[model samples]
Target: MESNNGIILRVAEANSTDPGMSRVRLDESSRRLLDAEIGDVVEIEKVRKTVGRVYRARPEDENKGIVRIDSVMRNNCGASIGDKVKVRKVRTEIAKKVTLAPIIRKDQRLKFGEGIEEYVQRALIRRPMLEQDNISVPGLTLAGQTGLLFKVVKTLPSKVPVEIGEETKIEIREEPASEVLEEGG
Candidate 1:
């Protein structure tokens, strides 16, 4: 038996301006089906489970039976474009702390200027995360612009989806993530 609150929608690429923001855009009816509103968190399930803040879809996308999500969301949910994924509203508690480690390759090294924690906090302050999810945040670096990849090593109150709030503490580990390897590595 399928849950009436959950909807299955085909995946679509997010708008250019929405990339890396941990957001999903859904049609009004879809939002109504889940009893969700903009800024509410929704659980996305495809083989894996992930969460994202909801937004209203573009006029052109309304009633298209699709959900627009960025690469990070897709990766977290293990869904690809045109694949159907289940989405439903989910309650999330404010995270007390979140631990993240850079998803770097074995031979590659990373260098960052001071205030990396602040930069990351600002980018992810309002996002929802499940432990072990991979997220990418855009940042400025010595090499110019880059997408910094991070793996959620752990979350306080473990095993539940949590949202990062202004009061949340963020921990960035210097060591690269051991379990997650770069593509072709």
Candidate 2:
């Protein structure tokens, strides 16, 4: 939920070698909807269920004004091409903590809170992964651990934007859900 507001985008899945990263390719319209620019990061919901940085779509791929997603997204959100999903800008300046619910793949079960958590500092820091300073718990099947997928159930607004910081803490809930297909997966 946004303390301000949010926009929705249509989904179109793409195959990528980088499973560890979940990226979004947006057309002009989609960008306008999110109030984002070429290098801005936006929060993608229901679909990938992960926050991703936004980029302009390729020249030929711009006609549809689609949110070009990756196989990693389709796998988790169970969203196929042409499926409409919610998209919006997270209010980084307003909220201190950003909550992420897990996105588990088909037939894969992981224990609750069974995932890797990465600390996301702003661009002033060494590496700026996504467009924003957000913690990313890459989506994957925990080794040898069965029956898990985290479901974040915190009561908040529909399109709330979470700001990341050095002390930003992400708590793994009692259930499983599932991010980036970090490299080597």
Candidate 3:
């Protein structure tokens, strides 16, 4: 489906290295439809709405009307692989501040040392997020490379899409997030 509001495209698996990168690949025509450029934020929606930076699709996938996004992004927007999602260019402001909380399961136990804050800041800088969105950040654990999930507890300017910037204040709550996980494998 195509409209002035947005273009509809099927969801496809992103590169393995793309998880937690907050990026999505779109066909040139799809990007043109949304008037979005690389690094520009695009709002994606189905039952939920979330944002991601745009990248050009690979030559083989060009003009296929498919969007390449990692599983984390799919969870954020509540869309599964092969599902159709609406994509539109959205205006975003640099966030003045943002608060996040870790999402931990009852049986999970993990500890982030003194540099946790800095790690999260680096992972999220330049990423666009909405309040209440669940975002994944890649981290190194004793086990190996692991993906950590955090909940966007609040944004300085309520009810607007905001991008995390170098100057943005990032606050991570010590308490575990109470929100239910909507992640899909």
Candidate 4:
């Protein structure tokens, strides 16, 4: 959905405690993948929909379920109010760290230990309070590095640099199937 129309900054700045709802912040990597802006309001549509089944428990237990996921088709800012941007089809995979610049004013000076990264980190730590599911990312998996934790503070659509229409074959090393489940009495 790469069009010639440009997007504008959709920023709302407030310095008081009653700033109302807080929007999701884009990190450096998210911006690059989406080709989005720091304060952009982009449009997204689902390119694909899937239903994942989980059948590992007993027939009468509370573990059998299916989850429907609709992956999105995306477009830029200033898109036509009602015009469908035409998601042609799936092309390739986008796997790269996109960038999201902090919308900080040039006149603002940080006091020693304060920086944009720190701000982003702090925001991420508080993200669970803003959403449901208690921040347990069911699909979180890290590829590189020997460590076993995907410490996700935030998840922008383009974090994997997975292209808008492209499919990324995330290298997963875990067994694709499951066995029994634990029940609490």
Candidate 5:
């Protein structure tokens, strides 16, 4: 389920220091699956130890890997190098939500949620956009105590330092109640 704002993105194209690293192009399905444009910033939520052919593929993080924004690329969104745009995450839900009860068996006792297959078949890039779209995120966004659904404040535009290499600066965006908070960076 692609988010109305954005979808699970991939580093389809990468223009590296090497001149040989030319423009990155997405395949037909990739283009359609991800409604991405040139110069648009892509939130590569997590990196995988194993390679994935498509956007949503299995994530292999056996070597001490977790759901952290591993890399930031501007190719998928059609942005060029040095594009000055902030990577702020919005709190409003833009897609659908999911409930863990569906998969949680009565006797199941897994310490964690989200199976590896989730990354592969569902969200190879990451799960924030999915969780955001669905409004099912537990922590960082979801309020367990009050059971209230409200938008969280991520990095402020000016305060949002440009992502260098891969920075763990993912924060919630907070704004006044009346402000028309938008979510795309």
Candidate 6:
């Protein structure tokens, strides 16, 4: 990976929740290191990778100035605690798509009528997916290790397809300025 052109901080591991959503914690010192504040988007870099994942900065109560990542990030970025990670502030643009996959098995259907199809519609434009509004995909076990009932196949910009329950695949893409406002745009 190229130099961050910002600051380098030690990497720490965090609990697994949304692997696709890369998050970082920053205390006063850590924020001072990045010269940034809350809600700022920063790129966390691991060596030997061409690109890095952008995570929104969240204020950390701890006094330690460090960057803590989750299991997915630790594994994906090949990072470990005390490893020098390159961090830099960045601006991320909306993508062309976003796809989500819930657990499912063969011969099973999503309990929410037209749910998956509708999800595709909203997600095509980057709108939030409400679980209560779009619930149930019975027949296949949905609960995940995080109790999230599903795994992230991909978020965006990282198009690598992952296989989930019963070999299901998910894809993500989208656009901005109403490009996704209309169907088939």
Predicted candidate 4 versus true structure: per-residue lDDT over 36-114, tens digit per residue: 4343332222222110111121222221121111111111111222232221112123322222222112222222332
Residues 15-131 of candidate 3 have per-residue lDDT tens digits of 577554467777677887657877776777766767777787776346458888777788886777889988777668988888887666433432665766666667788768687
- Candidate 1: stretches off by over 4 Å: 1-5, 18-20, 60-64, 105-123, 137-148, 157-161, 170-185
Backbone clash total for model 2 is: 28
TM-score for model 6?
0.43
Show how many residue pairs clash in every candidate, following the order shown: 0, 28, 0, 17, 24, 7
Residue pairs of candidate 1 with colliding backbone atoms: none
lDDT scores in order? 0.69, 0.48, 0.69, 0.24, 0.26, 0.44
lDDT of each residue in 134-157, candidate 6, tens digit only: 122223443342222232333443
Taking the tens digit of each residue's C-alpha lDDT, what string does model 5 give over 1-185?
Answer: 22323233323223335321212233334333345344333332222111111222133322111111112323212333333322212232212222221112222222334452242224212323222211212233222332123222222222211221112223222221222335557
**TM-score for each candidate, following the candidate numbering:** 0.66, 0.53, 0.68, 0.22, 0.20, 0.43
Q: What's the CA error at residue 174 for candidate 4, in Å?
A: 40
Q: Which candidate leads in TM-score?
A: 3
lDDT of 2 by residue, 67-151 (tens): 7766555545556777777766553333333344444553443232323343212321222222212232445555664323333
Native-referenced Cα lDDT, model 4: 0.24
